[PDB]
């Protein structure tokens, strides 16, 4: 015979092991593969599709009112409209996104993000906004003077009703963590703020309150690693009719 | 994985197994080998060195008196001087020899032996002896007529003060056993006897009693096998200060 | 299947074994390697850097007074200034060195050492010293007659404010042990003594007491083996906040 000896780790069941096991149905012939549309071979394909931010995650915003930001005409210049917390791990506007849900199955992330904003007013509604990304280190900028010193895009409404704010990967090392400390130097992304660049000017027969829809995807330099369970689902009891599977 | 099954003998500790085991000091670099005189690579090198027989294993022979045989002048012809029991396993004159101690670590033996006798009288002492080896089957020969019918050497004292009695390998099969039955047909070697061939004639100023020293080695056709523990050492208690190794 | 059998040593956990084990994160992609200055690939690089001896390991020498030896002007010739115990294993002036701390993780050592002495008096201070290494066997030499019969260097102060006393590897076999018996023939290194070769002559405006700093490194023929735990750290309780790692 062959002289063998057992190592530490013999007989354990690691749930991430990669071995061959015994077939329970010998000479079983599976169903032939058919072409089905929309095959996913890597979860970073899904993460690059844009999906709606809930920037209006406030009380008195019920259901689908949370998916849009209402802007109106202002009588003061340079006013803040909204800001977006870039904290993906903690429960903010980015959590229930395709880039948000798939990343919460992972601990580390890297790469650029893109925010897309579609203006959903009338054709007669005109306006200019400035969408500012601020790298971390300070507070969230409240005035337009302070906010435009960072990464920004100035957007005129019109025939193309959308801009992209690329949020660049600006970090010390390669990855950031999904830490519960949002204020950590290895987890904080920064801030996105929106200001009136000029104003929303509408005529008398247009609706005086117009809406923005915010989207976010990831770019193709985006990366994820260190897979963990998601915080987005849980249970404390059994589901209904789960006892009927044993009866 | 690899389908395996355990054989009988799995997990046992045989003390004569030959396997590789785990190093306790990884990347340890041993001391470089130096040439030391007198290297032994086979224990049959040691067995071929002659060493003193205790032919005088009698009472009133104390210590080193046991290593020599005193011969004197005789007034009768053809007289027996000494005989040597060739029983190596049982406690005789051959036990405390280099050929005797190393062979008692083994059960089977084979090959020729050589007995060397050095005469340690004066230069003026003259004499002739006959050293007879007798194959087994009968009693030990007491007269010189009976003893010289076997393998013998007739030795004149003089300028070369030593002879060799080759005890030839005369056996049925290849090996003999170190059985406790000395009288067995697979263990008995035979007898070695010494007689006066003429007489010890000394002058008046020489010492009238002269000594022989008997040596025995093995030849290079000698062989040993079936290793066993030696009867030559034992213990019933612990040695002194062996408890201090645990303190 | 394959007929196998288990050897002795199967299922053990040797802490120095060298095997492959199961990855807990499959297809994990580590952070890319960056060039960081000062890479160590062998601990004998660290052992060759000089570091301060505490030759003044006496009472009333508090803290950094232990790192320097104060010499003064003398009115008698040929006087002993200091001596250095070369016992690395026992707690002497060589223990808290780079050559001292890394070697106490090992049991055996070999190779040459170098002692460097930097004179830290004024520019106007002149003097000559003799730094004597004595091989073991006798007592530590107290007079300069006795001490200079061994390995020594005579040092004049001046534009180059440092000498090296090479302590040569003078030993019977290849290695020495870090035995607790300092007086053993396989552990004792010898003695280093310093004498006034002439005298410390300073002027009236220089400080009349000048200092030496003693350094020690290892050479590139130095070697260490038989790794053991260090005596230089220990604990009898838990550290503070180590219970908070479980809460």
């Amino acid at each position: 015979g062959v002289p063998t000896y057992l190592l530490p780790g013999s007989g354990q069941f690691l749930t991430t092991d990669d071995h061959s096991s015994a077939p329970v149905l010998p000479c079983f012939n599976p169903t032939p593969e058919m072409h089905i549309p929309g095959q996913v071979r890597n979860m970073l394909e899904v993460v690059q599709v844009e999906s709606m931010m809930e920037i209006n995650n406030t009380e008195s915003a019920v259901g689908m009112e949370r998916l849009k930001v209402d802007i109106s005409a202002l009588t003061d210049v340079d006013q803040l409209l909204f800001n977006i917390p870039l904290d993906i791990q903690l429960d903010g506007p980015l959590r229930n996104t395709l880039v948000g849900n798939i990343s919460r199955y992972y601990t580390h992330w890297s790469g650029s993000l893109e925010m897309t904003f579609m203006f959903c007013g009338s054709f007669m509604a005109t306006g200019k906004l400035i969408l500012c990304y601020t790298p971390p280190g300070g507070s969230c900028p409240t005035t337009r003077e302070t906010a435009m010193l960072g990464t920004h895009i100035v957007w005129d409404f019109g025939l193309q009703s959308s801009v992209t704010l690329i949020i660049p990967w600006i970090s010390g090392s390669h990855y950031r963590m999904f830490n519960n400390d949002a204020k950590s130097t290895n987890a904080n992304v920064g801030y996105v703020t929106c200001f009136m660049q000029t104003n929303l000017i509408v005529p008398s027969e247009s609706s005086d309150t117009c809406s923005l829809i915010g989207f976010i995807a990831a770019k193709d330099d985006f990366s994820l690693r260190l897979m963990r369970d998601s915080p987005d689902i849980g249970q404390i009891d059994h589901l209904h009719a789960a006892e009927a599977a044993y009866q | 994985g690899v389908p395996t099954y355990l054989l009988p003998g799995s997990g046992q500790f045989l003390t004569t197994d030959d396997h590789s085991s785990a190093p306790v000091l990884p990347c340890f670099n041993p001391t470089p080998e130096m040439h030391i005189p007198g290297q032994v690579r086979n224990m049959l090198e040691v067995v071929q060195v002659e060493s003193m027989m205790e032919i005088n294993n009698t009472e009133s022979a104390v210590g080193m008196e046991r290593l020599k045989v005193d011969i004197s002048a005789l007034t009768d012809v053809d007289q027996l001087l000494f005989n040597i029991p060739l029983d190596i396993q049982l406690d005789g004159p051959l036990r405390n020899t280099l050929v005797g101690n190393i062979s008692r670590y083994y059960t089977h033996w084979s090959g020729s032996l050589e007995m060397t006798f050095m005469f340690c009288g004066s230069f003026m002492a003259t004499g002739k002896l006959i050293l007879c080896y007798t194959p087994p089957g009968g009693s030990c020969p007491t007269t010189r007529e009976t003893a010289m019918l076997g393998t013998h050497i007739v030795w004149d004292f003089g300028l070369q003060s030593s002879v060799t009695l080759i005890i030839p390998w005369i056996s049925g099969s290849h090996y003999r056993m170190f059985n406790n039955d000395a009288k067995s047909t697979n263990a008995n070697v035979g007898y070695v006897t010494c007689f006066m061939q003429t007489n010890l004639i000394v002058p008046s100023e020489s010492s009238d009693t002269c000594s022989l020293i008997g040596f025995i080695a093995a030849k290079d056709d000698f062989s040993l096998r079936l290793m066993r523990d030696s009867p030559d050492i034992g213990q019933i208690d612990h040695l002194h200060a062996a408890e201090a190794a645990y303190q | 299947g394959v007929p196998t059998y288990l050897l002795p040593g199967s299922g053990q956990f040797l802490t120095t074994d060298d095997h492959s084990s199961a990855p807990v994160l499959p297809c994990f992609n580590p952070t890319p390697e960056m060039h960081i200055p000062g890479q160590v690939r062998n601990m004998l690089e660290v052992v060759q850097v000089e570091s301060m001896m505490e030759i003044n390991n006496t009472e009333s020498a508090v803290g950094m007074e232990r790192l320097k030896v104060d010499i003064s002007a003398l009115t008698d010739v040929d006087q002993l200034l200091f001596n250095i115990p070369l016992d690395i294993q026992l707690d002497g002036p060589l223990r808290n060195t780079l050559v001292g701390n890394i070697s106490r993780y090992y049991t055996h050592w070999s190779g040459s050492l170098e002692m460097t002495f930097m004179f830290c008096g004024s520019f106007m201070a002149t003097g000559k010293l003799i730094l004597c290494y004595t091989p073991p066997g006798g007592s530590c030499p107290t007079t300069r007659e006795t001490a200079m019969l061994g390995t020594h260097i005579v040092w004049d102060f001046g534009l180059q404010s440092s000498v090296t006393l090479i302590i040569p590897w003078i030993s019977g076999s290849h290695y020495r042990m870090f035995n607790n018996d300092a007086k053993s023939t396989n552990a004792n290194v010898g003695y280093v003594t310093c004498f006034m070769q002439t005298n410390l002559i300073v002027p009236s405006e220089s400080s009349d007491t000048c200092s030496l700093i003693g350094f020690i490194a290892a050479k590139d023929d130095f070697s260490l083996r038989l790794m053991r735990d260090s005596p230089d750290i220990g604990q009898i309780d838990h550290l503070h906040a180590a219970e908070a790692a479980y809460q």
Binding site: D18, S20, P23, R41, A217 | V2 | P26, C27
Partner: peptide
């Protein structure tokens, strides 16, 4: 894989082909 069935093998973790444009650019021009 000493088993005779091909589905008995270990997990196949070497499929690095992507096509994000079937989800990100599903338009005809």
């Amino acid at each position: 894989n000493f088993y005779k069935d091909s589905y008995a093998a270990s997990a196949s973790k070497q499929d690095f082909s992507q096509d994000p444009s079937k989800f990100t650019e599903p338009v005809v021009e």
